[PDB]
Write a protein that holds these residues in place. Structure first.
Motif: not given
Ligand SMILES: [K+]
Ligand SMILES: CC(C)N(Cc1ccccc1OCCCCCC(=O)O)C(=O)c1ccc(-c2ccoc2)cc1
Ligand SMILES: CCCCCCCO[C@@H]1O[C@H](CO)[C@@H](O)[C@H](O)[C@H]1O
Length: 271
Positions: A28-30, A128-132, A166-171
């Motif tokens: 996903a990040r790729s 599978i999430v980013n801030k956008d 999700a944004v906080k968790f991905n950090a």
């Molecule tokens: K993120």
């Protein structure tokens, strides 16, 4: 001794993870960072592009199979529900690939999944999430957060909190080997209501948590307080799912034309 056995235990859980989930966070990040590839996700950001995606992208669930069309916000809701049910199936096979889970009597297996999958889902969602926005259709599309905010209440309101989480968790920067353990600890949770064999589930949960503790020492050697942070994230997820169920009750009450999948109906009966 303890650290040795728990290492092997973690590896088997990781294999259960790699064997059963359709997308890894590494994959996903790729895609979300466009690092590698000849193919980029089609970006769904308004009505026109949503339609072009249904006309062009391949969806696990056939559009014609979704309950009859009602309206844009509801359609999006139906796709969210398809993917949720598909993730429940994956989480079921993942759990079943954990021998101590499969050893429980089947009724306890159902109870754990019933009360655990939504927490696990919203944890894994962060992959599978980013801030956008987030990935859809096995990575073939990317639906923007802004577009989802534009749907009418109550469908916009049930989405945005998950991005906040999700944004906080991905950090915290977990990898798939961390998540396998983390998700395993959400499912094998001795607190779930109506469990038959609580002490057995508690013991398993404790083994997973010790495995994760030692895993984070080796895999994230410089990350202070990371293990307690993840215990708080597990508590946070309970609250996120409480709110989610509350919003789902409101959708059931006020959006009577909106169909709810029967399996999720069986999940919400008791909450
Ligand atoms: K993120
Ligand atoms: C959590 C995952 C499973 N998920 C849904 C989702 C993501 C973030 C926030 C909320 C949300 O679903 C709230 C409804 C829950 C349903 C029923 C239930 O509670 O089980 C998705 O992966 C997803 C899939 C497809 C789309 C899509 C397609 C076209 O336009 C948008 C958007 C998301
Ligand atoms: C596939 C794993 C996920 C299953 C989630 C749904 C569980 O539903 C429950 O199934 C039980 C029968 O087994 C009933 O006794 C409960 O009333 C019902 O709520």
């Amino acid at each position: 001794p303890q650290v040795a056995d728990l290492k092997a235990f973690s590896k088997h859980i990781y294999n259960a993870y790699l064997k059963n989930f359709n997308m890894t966070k590494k994959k996903a990040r790729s895609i979300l960072t466009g690092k590698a590839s000849h193919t980029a996700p089609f970006v769904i950001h308004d009505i026109e592009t949503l339609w072009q995606a249904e006309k062009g992208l391949v969806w696990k669930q056939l559009v014609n199979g979704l309950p009859p069309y009602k309206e844009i916000s509801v359609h999006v809701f139906y796709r969210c529900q398809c993917t949720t049910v598909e993730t429940v199936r994956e989480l079921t096979e993942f759990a079943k690939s954990i021998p101590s889970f499969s050893s429980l009597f089947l009724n306890d297996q159902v109870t754990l999944l019933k009360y655990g999958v939504h927490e696990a889902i919203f944890a894994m969602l962060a992959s599978i999430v980013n801030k956008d926005g987030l990935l859809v259709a096995n990575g073939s599309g990317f639906v923007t957060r802004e577009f989802l905010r534009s749907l009418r209440k109550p469908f916009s309101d049930i989405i945005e909190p998950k991005f906040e989480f999700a944004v906080k968790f991905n950090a915290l920067e977990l990898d798939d080997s961390d998540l396998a353990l983390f998700i395993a600890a959400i499912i094998l949770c001795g607190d779930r209501p109506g469990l038959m064999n609580v002490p057995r589930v508690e013991a398993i949960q404790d083994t997973i948590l010790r495995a994760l503790e030692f895993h984070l020492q080796a895999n994230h050697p410089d990350a202070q307080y990371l293990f307690p942070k993840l215990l708080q994230k597990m508590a946070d997820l309970r609250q996120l799912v409480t709110e989610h169920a509350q919003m789902m009750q409101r959708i059931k009450k006020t959006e009577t034309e909106t169909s709810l999948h029967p399996l999720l109906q069986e999940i919400y009966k008791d909450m």
